[PDB]
Structure formats: structure tokens, C-alpha cells
């Protein structure tokens, strides 16, 4: 029994129809579904072992699923792999191994106004001279969305800008630019167009779609989604290849709709030939495309069929000259760094060296939090969560799952930021990870030792540091003493063999028997286990 997931805005019951062609040769029927918000809830149900058999989604997300081993690696015959364009397999790889089947391909194209503009420029540089023309009778040359990088990245990446370097089958989180002479050359030309009036600088997505669909602008930059609302706009248009900057093709981000196979699925065996020899023919794709258009498709066979649409032939051409969008989670910092970096460069608020060098350092900063959290094993997380309790509500500490999430929660409450490492440095120092402090933060041990005597500099309250140092000198068996040497006392507790001594302190604060000035209970139970646990209390209680 095959079960397919796919979004509602797709041709899902055209997919349900190749699935009924399939069952009359098989008996095994498939039931396509469009669960609401399926991208978010597939990780949740697959770790239970219940996700559909096949999952249809954009490729960028499939990386996170594979990072958690939620998609098994497919095994297509190599003679099959040639049935599709070469680049579409670079989008379905993690650790170099193939993960999903490419289905469709999406990219931005140049969309012009044939009545207004009979011939499109081959070239970005032709446009200032051109906008000067149409300006002479109250119409702009180009108007497109400048509020997101996805629309401004093609010009920026043209001269050699890239997000992450894809080489020999996998990405390098270390190499990213964004701060190279290509990204600078493309952004300066963008910044100046605005500087010169050839583009108003608050042109959002809908302002541009207004100007174009009303014949106020010669051309725009958009994708196959905006085709519907300009077909009804009643303006004669065409879409072709984006102009060339510095003699080099504009590189838009390419999205690949892909079908992945669930790792915890009985039917991987049979899900393959459903995709290879029924869905991915001219027959299965024209079925889904006759429902709702797949845009341009990855299968070479049916693509040429669709290419006699001048529009599908163009979104395909830009896709080839384009940049396959990386499917790794470090890309969430890319959109922030670059969106804020074009918004400040184009407004005049920053230099393009200033803006882009700032974008670079934000990526180095977000990558460093990754590299740090990857060295923090699960016990260090329990320690870091207890030390962070003063400032992060443990309410929202149900969703906290790994060290990186703790770091992101701190960015939220603006105690960890690009310019303020002081709390993170103190956290690692408290939990005695001096190897990470030198390696990723350039901080000697004496320097932290000597940062925290300076008054009002240490943030973690000594009451927190006192309790953590006590949980450090208490073993599993020394804790079985604490557990039953406070049941001797009043409860004031549901305890159990699942709670470490730190979970006992939180649960004593929670009963208000252990506080910044409530230590009688604590001072007794420690004197019965290890006496020198008592001395830690007295030294803290010497400082007030």
C-alpha cells in the first residue's frame, strides 16, 4: 500500500490518476493526499514510523529530512539517470548519496511587455540607457521585487557570487561569498540603478506586479507562479533569459520539486518502479501537468514537449545557468545576512563593501555557533540549560533539543549576538569547556578567570553557580543518598530514578524550599553525604 503526500497547490489528483493506472497492473493501490502544512509535520510523524511512503516537496527541505535519516537513499539505474537533465541530481544529494527523484524545475525569468517593449535587452547594462527612453513617456523600464534576496540574487551572483560552494557532491559550510568581487560588482550595479532612479527602492513584490500588469513598466523579474495573474491582466507578454551582467549569465536560485522515499517504510521496493516507470514517463508527467502545470520538468523527454512554450523554454534556460539552492540548514543565516545586506546597501545606509562584509561576518558567526554546538554532548546541554534558567524561561524549554537551539533561544532574548559574546563565553567557562573557548572564541583560561571578578560582569548568579558546582561533586550513588535523605524530610516532591540532582534543585525551587536565601534544607542533606559539599555553600554565603 503506497501513500503519497504532496501539496494542495499541485496537480495531486492527476497524480492520483497515474496512481490508478499503477494499481490495475499491481493491485496495490496508491492514495495521494495533501495534508495541510505537510512539510512541518512530516518530520514529526516519520520519527514515529508513520509518514507516507512517498513525499513530494521542494528539494531544499529534503536535506533536513536526510540529516535525520528520514529519507532512504534511492538506487536509480544509471541509464535511467540520463533520462533527466544533469544538474537536477545535484539537488537531491546529502553526503553525496542520492535521496529523491527530481520531478520539476523552477526559476526566475525576465518577463517583458511586447507592446511596450518589442525586444528585451540581452544585457543588464543596456537598461539605464533604456529606462531613460521609456521614462520620456511616463513608463519605467524595469520594476521587480527588491525586498527579498531571491529576486536580487541573480544579478548579485552573476559576476561570481555564491552562497555555499558545491564541489564534488557536497557543500562546504566554510566557504561562502557573499563578500567577493562578484557579489560586490553585482550589488553596486543594483545599488546605483536605485541611486539613479531607474528603480524605486521600496518596490516590493506587489508594487512591481501592479506596475507591470497595468502597463506602467516595460519588464519585471518573476517566476511561473505570476503567469496566471498576468494572463488575466490582459497584457501581451513573453518571458526570456534574464540579462547578462559583465558578460556573464544571471544565476537565479533553482528549485526542484522532488519525490523522496520514507526511510521507515515497508514499500521502498515498490515505490521505486512507481516513480521510475510510471510517474517519470511522458505519461505520468503529462498526467500531473494536465492537472496543474509542473512548469518545466526534469525529464528530458517531456521537457522538449513542453519547451514549445516559449515560457517553459525560458524558466528552463535560466535554471540551467542558475544556482541550485543549497539544501543545508545553514542557509537560514544566508537569507538574513543577504536580505539585511541589500536593504542597507540600496538605501544608502551602507557601502557595498560595508554591507557585504557585514553579511560575511554574520555567516561566520552563525557557522561558529554550529561548530560549537556540535561539540556539546547531551550532558553539557543539561548543564547549560540549568545555568541559563535565570534568563531563559524553562517554560519554553520543552522545545529545546540541542545546544544550537539553546544558542538561538539566547539570540531571541538578545543576550547572545554578533557583538555580545560575553554570556556564551561565561557559559562554556562555567561548564569547564576550555577547549572550545580557545578553539572557537580565542579566550584563555586566565582571561575568563579574570573577566568574572570584575564586578557586575558575570551574569550567571552565584546562586546558580553554587548549585551547579554541587551537582558536579555528586555521583549516581551519591545521588541515591540525596534522593532518600530528603524523602526523610517533607515531600514536597514526586521523585524517581529519572531525575538528576539538577532536576531535584529545580523541583525544590518549584516547591519553594530552596532559594537564594533558603538553604537550611540544602545544608542538612549535603552534610550527610559528603561533608565538603557543605563548604561550597559557606563560601557562597560569605559573599553578601
UniProtKB/Swiss-Prot annotation:
Prosegment location in residue numbers: 363-544
Post-translational note: Generation of the p10 and p18 subunits requires association with the death-inducing signaling complex (DISC), whereas additional processing is likely due to the autocatalytic activity of the activated protease. GZMB and CASP10 can be involved in these processing events.
Signal sequence coordinates: none
Tissues expressing the protein: Isoform 1, isoform 5 and isoform 7 are expressed in a wide variety of tissues. Highest expression in peripheral blood leukocytes, spleen, thymus and liver. Barely detectable in brain, testis and skeletal muscle.
Coiled-coil annotated residue ranges, if any: none
Subcellular location: Cytoplasm; Nucleus; Cell projection, Lamellipodium
Domain named DED: residues: 364-442, 462-539
Family: Belongs to the peptidase C14A family.
Disorder association: Caspase-8 deficiency: Disorder resembling autoimmune lymphoproliferative syndrome (ALPS). It is characterized by lymphadenopathy, splenomegaly, and defective CD95-induced apoptosis of peripheral blood lymphocytes (PBLs). It leads to defects in activation of T-lymphocytes, B-lymphocytes, and natural killer cells leading to immunodeficiency characterized by recurrent sinopulmonary and herpes simplex virus infections and poor responses to immunization.
Domain comment quoted from the record: The catalytic domain is sufficient for recruitment to lamellipodia but catalytic activity is not necessary.
Subunit structure: Heterotetramer that consists of two anti-parallel arranged heterodimers, each one formed by a 18 kDa (p18) and a 10 kDa (p10) subunit. Component of the death-induced signaling complex (DISC) composed of cell surface receptor FAS/CD95 or TNFRSF1A, adapter protein FADD and the CASP8 protease; recruitment of CASP8 to the complex is required for processing of CASP8 into the p18 and p10 subunits. Component of the AIM2 PANoptosome complex, a multiprotein complex that drives inflammatory cell death (PANoptosis). Interacts with CFLAR and PEA15. Interacts with TNFAIP8L2. Interacts with CASP8AP2. (Microbial infection) Interacts with human cytomegalovirus/HHV-5 protein vICA/UL36; this interaction inhibits CASP8 activation.
Functional summary from the UniProt entry: Thiol protease that plays a key role in programmed cell death by acting as a molecular switch for apoptosis, necroptosis and pyroptosis, and is required to prevent tissue damage during embryonic development and adulthood. Initiator protease that induces extrinsic apoptosis by mediating cleavage and activation of effector caspases responsible for FAS/CD95-mediated and TNFRSF1A-induced cell death. Cleaves and activates effector caspases CASP3, CASP4, CASP6, CASP7, CASP9 and CASP10. Binding to the adapter molecule FADD recruits it to either receptor FAS/TNFRSF6 or TNFRSF1A.
Protein's name in the database: Caspase-8
Organism: Homo sapiens
Gene from which this protein is expressed: CASP8
